[PDB]
Every structure is written in structure tokens, then in C-alpha cells.
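Annual report, structural modelling task.

Input specification for the copper (II) ion complex:
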Amino acid sequence: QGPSFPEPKVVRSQGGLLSLKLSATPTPLAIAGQRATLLTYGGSFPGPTLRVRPRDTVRLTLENRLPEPTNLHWHGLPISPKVDDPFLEIPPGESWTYEFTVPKELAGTFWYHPHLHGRVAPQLFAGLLGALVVESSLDAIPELREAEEHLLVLKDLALQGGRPAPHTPMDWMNGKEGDLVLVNGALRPTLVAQKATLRLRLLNASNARYYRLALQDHPLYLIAADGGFLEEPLEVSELLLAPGERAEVLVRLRKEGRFLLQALPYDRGAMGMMDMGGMAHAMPQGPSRPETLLYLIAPKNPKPLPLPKALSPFPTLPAPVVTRRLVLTEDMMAARFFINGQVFDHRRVDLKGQAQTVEVWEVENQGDMDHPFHLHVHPFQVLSVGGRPFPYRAWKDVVNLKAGEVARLLVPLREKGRTVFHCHIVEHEDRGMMGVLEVG
Ligand SMILES: [Cu+2]
Ligand SMILES: [Cu+2]
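The model returned the following structure:
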């Protein structure tokens, strides 16, 4: 009712249970004024938003109707790696039911996508992704309850012949970016705000594109990172979202008008072709061109809410028991990517850690591109990047490292089992940059 805004269909838990059969299938769809056949969950792009409360049971049956094997990664959920199993393969025509309980203190925006090694990048690029929202008691305080809430799934695409464009040799090296920069599967939609305070859940579900988000004439007030709430709102003029990262921001519309949400130029170190330059840039691709993501129309006579004074206190973490060093390196021309000089081998365990202990991980980017590092199953606290302090305390599961940057992460090891860590430029993961952690 009122103005429409494109947003994925929401499926909600009922009486503590979210039970849902989701098919992964090729699907003809309308997209940016054309018809295209994508790979989708539940017949839509993006897939449906699953919305649960803490302590809910999730029983998701994935029915594989693709021509190739697949599986699901529950990105950012601290659940068992025997449920969130990166090594599982669901053959075409077969089904698999994922059953888990939502942890009691969890809150924020998460997502699901394929994680069959070697096929992630084509499958994710083809449209297989969806959001998972864990509601929190904090959503009831007036300063958030009365905000207008929307999910914004940021995902670019490129089509050729009415299907997702194939990966080129350059895509395996740089990660694939597409010419259609979409919001919730729509091109430059318009959001007609009905409240003066907005609460926007942001999800970068792109293969490799970075979104340096800025809203004309407005700061953003960050209230949640990947894995949960900040301790209090943080005002920012702009917000860089790397592939796989999520944020929740409050927007306070002061005046009437139409304001662009843009992805400002960002240079993530991608490499260009043909060596024959004059002066300007050369063969580094250089900064991305700016993109308009959506248009925001403020309500008449807008009066925003006061910001919440506080959000969620961040638990103090015990002293770490071990320090780890993970060096990321690249061989760009072979498009091969390494952690500590090795490529992923599913038969090899790279790190052995103890359940119920805290570790510090020093992840060092000795490449020339940004690499966004992701750890399954165990959310972490970023303490510092490049020797300087992180700007807030919150659970993260992806941390962006620019060339030469070293991140120090506090990693509480929860669930026992074998899981992975990898770059979330998913082409790099497919081409080597993944390793295996075993918790016992
Ligand atoms: Cu992910
Ligand atoms: Cu990478």
C-alpha cells in the first residue's frame, strides 16, 4: 500500500519455526526492461528474505533443480559447520534439509548463497542469493520501532543473450563486475519515504564490486555491522561495503527533496589490459565510475526521530590463547591466489584450534588488490587495521584489507568441526584463496 518499492518477499517464522522448501532453479524474469533467465532461489531475484527471531528453528529444504551440483552457505550465522557444511555437495535433482536453531543473542542481517568450491562465482553471479534477518528486542525501542525499514540488496549483473554473462579470463583475475548495478534486482528504483527516519539494511551480494555509499546531503548513522549491533550509533559521511559485508544505518531526512544514493568512485586495485599507455592512468583499471543506486524522496515536512542513545553493549572477550598469521598473496597473470603460499585443498587442514578459546588472527594482504577476508562459523572482532584502531565494536564476519594492510582479529572459537576461511571476491576463492580451519 501507498508507494511501492521493489524488495524481496519475506518469509517469517511462526510459533518458533521457519519451515520452507526452496528450489534452486533456472528462471525467466523481467530485469531492467528485459527478459533474462537467471538461477534463482524460490523463483525470484533476489531470493526470499527469511525473517526469524532468536531461538527459532530453521528447517530449510534446498531442492536442487540446477544442471550442476550446489550447496548453501549461511553467511555470518554462528551455527554448526555440520549444518553450514562448506564441503557438502547436493547433486542435480536431489534435496537437502538444513536444520538449526538461531542463537539467543544474535541480531542483524545475514544472507545465504552457494558455496560449492569451483562453482561459487558463476552460481552467485547468476542470481543465487537471499537475505536472512534476525529480529532483536532492540527493534522495539521507539527510536527504531518508528523508523521506516527496508532491505537493500546490492548486486550487479551483466547479461549476454538473455542469460548471465560468462566469466572471461580477466574476471577470474579481477572478480566479475557487471554493467547493471541493481538494488533488489531493480535498476535505480525510487523510494518514496513515508517516515522521516529510515532504517536501511544494506547487503553487498556482488561477486566483486565495492560500494562506497553516500547519500546526497545526508550522513548515515551506522547502528549495525555484519554480525550485530554497534554499541551506539556512529555518524559517517560515507560507508564502504565490500563484497559479503552488511550494515544497518539510520537515515534522518531533514528537508523535503529527491536525494541520490550513490556508489562513489572506489579503486580496489583491479588490473586492466594491453600495455600501451600515455599518461592518465595506464593498466591499473583505476577508480570505478560513480553509480546512482536509488532515488530517495523525503516525506513532506519531515521531522526525524532522535537517535537511540545506546544500542547493544559488546561483550568483553577473554585473553587470546594463540596468535596466527595468514598472508594473502596473488599471481595475477595465472589468476591464482594463495594463503601462506598454498592454494585450497579440501583434503588439507591448515589450522587446528580449540573450542572455547579466543585466538588473535593477523591477516596480511601482501597483494596489490583489496581482498575481503571471510571466516565461516566464527564471528570475530576487528581490533585494528594497519596498526590503527577499528572505529567501532561489533561482530564482523568479513573484513576488507587494502594492499599491504594487516588486520588483527579477535576470533572466539565456538562450534567444533571443520570449516573454511576465504576471500569474498568469490572468483579468488574459486581460484585458490581459501583454507581449512578445524576446531576441536
Ligand atoms: Cu558469503
Ligand atoms: Cu581476493
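The CA atoms of residues 114 and 123 lie 7 Å apart.
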